[PDB]
Amino acid sequence: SDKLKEAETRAEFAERSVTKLEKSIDDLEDELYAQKLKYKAISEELDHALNDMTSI
Amino acid sequence: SDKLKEAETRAEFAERSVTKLEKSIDDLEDELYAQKLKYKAISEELDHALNDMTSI
Amino acid sequence: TTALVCDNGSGLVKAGFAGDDAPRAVFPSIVGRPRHQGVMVGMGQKDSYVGDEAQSKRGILTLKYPIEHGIITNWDDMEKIWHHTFYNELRVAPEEHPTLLTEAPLNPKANREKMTQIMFETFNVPAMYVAIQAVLSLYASGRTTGIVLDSGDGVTHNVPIYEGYALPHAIMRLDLAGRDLTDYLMKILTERGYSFVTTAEREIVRDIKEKLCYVALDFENEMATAASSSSLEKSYELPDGQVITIGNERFRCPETLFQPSFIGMESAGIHETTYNSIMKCDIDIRKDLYANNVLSGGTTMYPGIADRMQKEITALAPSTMKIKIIAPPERKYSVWIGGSILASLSTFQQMWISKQEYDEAGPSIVHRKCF
Amino acid sequence: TTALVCDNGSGLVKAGFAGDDAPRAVFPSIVGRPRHQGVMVGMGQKDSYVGDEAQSKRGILTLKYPIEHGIITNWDDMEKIWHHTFYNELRVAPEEHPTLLTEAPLNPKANREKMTQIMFETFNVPAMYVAIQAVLSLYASGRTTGIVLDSGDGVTHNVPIYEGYALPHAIMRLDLAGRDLTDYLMKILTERGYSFVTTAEREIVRDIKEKLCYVALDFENEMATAASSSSLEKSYELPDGQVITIGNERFRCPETLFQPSFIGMESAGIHETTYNSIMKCDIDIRKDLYANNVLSGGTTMYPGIADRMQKEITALAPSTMKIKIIAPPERKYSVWIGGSILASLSTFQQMWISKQEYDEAGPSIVHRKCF
Ligand SMILES: Nc1ncnc2c1ncn2[C@@H]1O[C@H](COP(=O)(O)OP(=O)(O)O)[C@@H](O)[C@H]1O
Ligand SMILES: Nc1ncnc2c1ncn2[C@@H]1O[C@H](COP(=O)(O)OP(=O)(O)O)[C@@H](O)[C@H]1O
Numbered sequence: 001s002d003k004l005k006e007a008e009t010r011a012e013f014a015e016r017s018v019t020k021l022e023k024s025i026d027d028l029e030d031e032l033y034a035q036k037l038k039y040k041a042i043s044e045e046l047d048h049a050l051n052d053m054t055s056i
Numbered sequence: 057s058d059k060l061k062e063a064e065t066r067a068e069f070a071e072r073s074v075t076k077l078e079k080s081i082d083d084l085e086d087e088l089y090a091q092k093l094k095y096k097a098i099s100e101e102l103d104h105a106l107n108d109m110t111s112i
Numbered sequence: 113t114t115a116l117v118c119d120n121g122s123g124l125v126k127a128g129f130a131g132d133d134a135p136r137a138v139f140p141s142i143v144g145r146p147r148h149q150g151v152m153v154g155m156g157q158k159d160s161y162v163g164d165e166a167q168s169k170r171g172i173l174t175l176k177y178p179i180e181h182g183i184i185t186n187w188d189d190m191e192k193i194w195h196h197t198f199y200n201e202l203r204v205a206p207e208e209h210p211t212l213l214t215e216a217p218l219n220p221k222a223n224r225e226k227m228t229q230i231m232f233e234t235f236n237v238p239a240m241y242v243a244i245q246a247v248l249s250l251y252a253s254g255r256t257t258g259i260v261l262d263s264g265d266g267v268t269h270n271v272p273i274y275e276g277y278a279l280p281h282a283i284m285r286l287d288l289a290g291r292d293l294t295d296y297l298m299k300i301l302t303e304r305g306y307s308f309v310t311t312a313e314r315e316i317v318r319d320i321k322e323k324l325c326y327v328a329l330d331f332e333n334e335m336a337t338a339a340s341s342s343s344l345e346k347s348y349e350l351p352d353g354q355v356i357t358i359g360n361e362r363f364r365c366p367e368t369l370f371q372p373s374f375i376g377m378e379s380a381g382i383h384e385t386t387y388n389s390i391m392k393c394d395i396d397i398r399k400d401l402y403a404n405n406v407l408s409g410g411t412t413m414y415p416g417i418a419d420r421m422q423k424e425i426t427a428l429a430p431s432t433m434k435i436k437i438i439a440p441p442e443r444k445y446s447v448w449i450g451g452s453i454l455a456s457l458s459t460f461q462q463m464w465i466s467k468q469e470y471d472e473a474g475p476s477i478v479h480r481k482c483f
Numbered sequence: 484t485t486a487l488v489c490d491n492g493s494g495l496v497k498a499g500f501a502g503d504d505a506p507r508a509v510f511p512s513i514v515g516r517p518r519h520q521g522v523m524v525g526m527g528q529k530d531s532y533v534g535d536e537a538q539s540k541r542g543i544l545t546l547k548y549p550i551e552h553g554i555i556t557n558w559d560d561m562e563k564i565w566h567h568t569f570y571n572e573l574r575v576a577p578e579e580h581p582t583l584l585t586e587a588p589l590n591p592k593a594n595r596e597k598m599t600q601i602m603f604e605t606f607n608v609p610a611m612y613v614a615i616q617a618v619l620s621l622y623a624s625g626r627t628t629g630i631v632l633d634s635g636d637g638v639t640h641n642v643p644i645y646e647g648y649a650l651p652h653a654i655m656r657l658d659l660a661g662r663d664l665t666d667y668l669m670k671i672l673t674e675r676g677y678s679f680v681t682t683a684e685r686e687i688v689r690d691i692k693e694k695l696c697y698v699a700l701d702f703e704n705e706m707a708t709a710a711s712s713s714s715l716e717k718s719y720e721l722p723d724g725q726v727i728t729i730g731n732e733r734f735r736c737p738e739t740l741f742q743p744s745f746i747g748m749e750s751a752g753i754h755e756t757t758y759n760s761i762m763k764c765d766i767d768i769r770k771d772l773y774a775n776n777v778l779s780g781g782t783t784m785y786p787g788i789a790d791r792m793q794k795e796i797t798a799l800a801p802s803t804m805k806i807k808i809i810a811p812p813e814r815k816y817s818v819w820i821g822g823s824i825l826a827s828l829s830t831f832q833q834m835w836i837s838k839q840e841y842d843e844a845g846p847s848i849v850h851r852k853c854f
C-alpha cells in the first residue's frame with residue numbers, strides 16, 4: 001500500500017509538470033512567432049527600400 | 057502488487073515524457089535566444105548606418 | 113581521521129561522517145519525560161527518552177523540542193541530544209573527531225558561544241567549526257553564485273552569494289517555517305471537527321501535513337474549485353482508525369508561506385522576500401541571482417512549490433530577465449551534503465578552531481578570524 | 484627585433500607591435516579590489532582584477548582608475564597595469580623589446596621620470612622613448628602641418644604644428660574630457676529619477692553616453708524641439724531590465740565641451756580654445772592651420788561634432804579663410820597608429836634612450852636631448 005501511494009503521487013506530480021511545460025512551450029513558440037513577424041515586416045520594408053535603391 | 061507495477065510503469069513513462077518536454081523547451085528557448093541575437097544585431101547595424109549617414 | 117558533520121537543525125538532527133552522500137542517522141530532536149505515574153516495578157523505565165525512541169512511546173510522554181527558532185532555549189536538553197547523537201546513533205567517541213556544526217544566520221551570539229563551549233568542555237572534541245546553513249546548501253548544488261532560500265523547520269533565511277563573496281547586508285531572515293505551518297494546520301483542522309491538542313498529536317498533524325498538503329499554483333482558482341467539486345478531498349487514517357477527510361485545508365496550510373498574514377505575521381511571503389533580497393544587491397549581479405535561485409531545506413518539499421515561486425517572481429521581476437529555480441530532488445539533506453563536501457576539502461583543513469586556540473582566547477574565539 | 488608601441492592613455496590602454504594597423508589588445512585601465520567578505524573556500528579568489536577582467540566582475544569590485552588627468556596618481560596600480568599588459572595581453576617578455584610610451588603635453592616632470600625609471604628598473608626594457616600624444620595623431624593623418632585637437636578621456640590638449648616645427652608657446656591644454664562628461668551625464672540623469680552612485684555604475688553611465696549622446700548642431704533649437712515633440716526620446720536597457728528613456732539629456736551631456744560653464748569650469752569651449760591656439764601662431768601660417776584642423780582622441784567620436792566645430796570656427800574666423808576639419812573614421816586609435824608609424828621609421832631608430840645612457844645620467848635623461 002505504501003508503494004502504491006508513492007507511485008500515485010509521483011504520477012500526479014509528473015502529469016502536472018508536463019501540463020505546465022506544454023503550456024510554457026506553446027507560449028514561447030507564440031513569442032518567437034511574433035518576433036519573427038516583426039523581423040519579416042522590417043525586412044519587407046528594407047526590401048522595398050532596396051527596390052527603390054535599384055533606381056538610386 | 058499488480059496495481060503497484062501498473063502505477064510505477066505509468067509514472068516512469070511520465071518522467072520520461074517530462075524529460076523529453078524539458079529538452080524540447082530548452083531547444084526552442086535556445087532558438088529564440090539566437091533569433092533575439094539576430095534582431096539585436098540587425099537593429100545595431102541599422103543604427104550604425106543611421107549614425108554614419110547622419111555623421112557622413 | 114574523519115570529521116563529524118553534525119547539523120543540529122530544528123526538528124530533525126542529521127549527522128554522519130564527512131565524505132558520504134547521505135547522513136548516517138536522521139531522527140527527530142525531541143526529549144520527552146514521562147508524565148503519568150507508572151505502576152509496574154522493574155520495567156526499566158528511564159527518565160527521558162530522546163530521539164527516535166520518543167516517537168514510539170509518544171503516547172505517554174510530553175515531547176518538547178529543545179530548539180525553538182534556530183536559537184536554543186533549553187541547554188540541558190540540547191546537551192542530552194548531542195550526547196545521544198554521538199554515542200548511540202554513531203557510536204564514535206568525540207575525543208577523536210572534529211565536528212562541524214551549522215547555525216542559522218543572524219542568530220544571537222550567546223547561542224554560538226555556548227555551543228562551542230559545550231563542544232570543547234563536555235564532549236572534549238579536538239576541533240570544531242560553525243558554518244552558516246546557507247553556504248553549505250550552495251556548496252551542495254555545485255554552484256558558486258546564486259541566492260539560496262533555506263526554508264527549514266525553525267526559521268526561513270535567504271542568503272544571496274555572488275562569486276563566493278557573501279553579501280552581509282542582503283540577508284533576509286524570516287521566522288515563519290514548518291513549525292508554524294504545523295500549528296496553523298492544526299488550527300484549521302478544527303473547522304471540520306477534528307481537534308488535536310496534545311503535544312503528541314502535533315506529530316500526527318505533522319504527518320498529515322507531510323503526506324497530503326501541496327502548494328496551489330493559483331490560490332483563488334483552487335479555492336473556487338474545492339468549493340464546488342469534490343475531487344480534492346483526500347482521506348487519511350489516524351493511528352487508531354477513524355479516517356479523516358481533508359478538503360481545501362490541503363493547499364491552505366502551505367499557502368501561509370506566500371501570505372504570512374494568515375497566521376497574523378506582518379511580513380511578506382517567501383515569494384517577495386527573495387525579490388527584496390535580490391534588489392538590495394548591486395545592479396550588476398542581479399541577472400545571475402535571478403538565473404540561479406536555489407531552494408533548500410525541508411519545507412520546500414511541497415509538491416508544486418517550484419512552479420508557484422517561479423510564477424510569483426516572474427510576475428515581480430522585469431520581463432527580460434530569465435527566472436530559474438533550482439530544486440534538486442535531494443533538497444532535505446542539501447545542507448548536510450554541502451557540509452560533507454566542505455569538511456572533505458583540503459583547503460579547509462586549516463580553518464578548524466583548534467583546542468589550544470580556544471584555551472588561549474576563551475569561547476569568544478568563534479567571532480574572531482576563525483569564523 | 485620589433486618595438487612595443489604602448490599607449491597608456493587614461494580610460495583605455497592600447498598596445499601592440501609596431502608596424503600593424505590596429506592595437507593588438509585594447510582594455511580599460513582599471514584595478515579593482517574586492518570589497519565584500521567572501522565565504523566560498525578554494526574558489527581561487529584573487530586580490531586585484533585588472534584590465535578587462537574587472538569589467539565582468541564589476542558587481543562586487545571597487546574599480547579605481549590609476550590615471551586621473553594625464554598624470555599618474557597611484558604608481559603601484561600603474562605598475563600592475565603595465566605588468567598585465569606585457570605578460571597577459573601580449574605575452575612578450577619586455578627584456579627583448581623597445582617600448583614607446585605616450586604622454587600628454589605640459590605634464591609634471593616627475594611623472595615622466597618615474598615612468599622611465601620603472602620601465603628601466605622593473606621591466607628592464609632595452610630602450611624606451613616618450614612621445615607627445617599629438618604629434619603621433621598628426622603622423623597618422625599623413626600630414627606634416629595642422630593643428631590637432633586630441634580630446635582624450637583624461638585631458639584635452641591642442642598642439643599646433645607647422646612644417647614639422649612645433650610651436651611650444653601655442654599649446655592650450657584643457658582638463659575637460661570624457662570623464663567629466665560621464666560625471667555630468669550621471670549628474671543630470673538624476674532629473675528623471677535614475678540614480679547611479681556606485682563606482683561600478685559609472686561604467687553603465689559611460690555606456691549610455693557612448694551609445695546615445697550626440698552633439699547638437701544648434702543648441703537652442705534642439706532645446707526647443709526636445710521640449711515640444713518627443714521624437715528624440717531614445718530608450719536603453721540596463722544590465723538588468725527596467726529600460727530608461729533619455730530625453731534632452733542626449734545632447735546636453737556633450738554640449739559641455741563647447742560650454743564648460745555647465746560643470747562650473749571657467750574656460751572657453753573646445754571651439755574657442757582652438758581659435759585662440761591658432762591666433763597665438765604667426766600671421767603667415769594661420770591659413771594652413773585653418774585648412775588642416777585635425778580631430779583625434781576618443782571623445783571626438785560624438786555623432787555630429789565635426790559639423791558643430793566647423794560652424795563655430797567659421798563663425799569666429801575671418802570670412803575669407805577656408806575652414807576644414809579632418810575627422811578620419813579611425814579616430815580612436817589615431818594616436819596609436821601614428822605611434823606605430825613613428826616606431827617603424829628608419830630615421831627614428833637612433834633616437835631611443837639606450838639603457839647604458841640611462842645608467843650614466845639617471846632618470847633625468849628624458850628631459851635631455853633624447854626628449
Ligand atoms: N516531504 C515533505 N513534505 C512536506 N513537508 C516536509 C516534508 N519533509 C519535511 N517536511 C517539513 O520540514 C521539516 C523538516 O525540515 P528540516 O529541513 O529537517 O529542518 P532543519 O533545517 O531543522 O533540518 C518537518 O518539520 C516538516 O514539517
Ligand atoms: N563611440 C564613442 N562615442 C562617444 N564617446 C566615446 C566613444 N568611444 C569612446 N568614447 C569616450 O572616449 C573615452 C576613451 O577615450 P580614449 O581615446 O581611449 O582616451 P585615451 O586618450 O586615454 O586613450 C571613453 O571614456 C569614452 O567616454
Ligand SMILES: [Mg+2]
Nearest residue numbers: 121264409447
Ligand atoms: Mg536546515
Ligand SMILES: [Mg+2]
Nearest residue numbers: 492635780818
Ligand atoms: Mg589619447
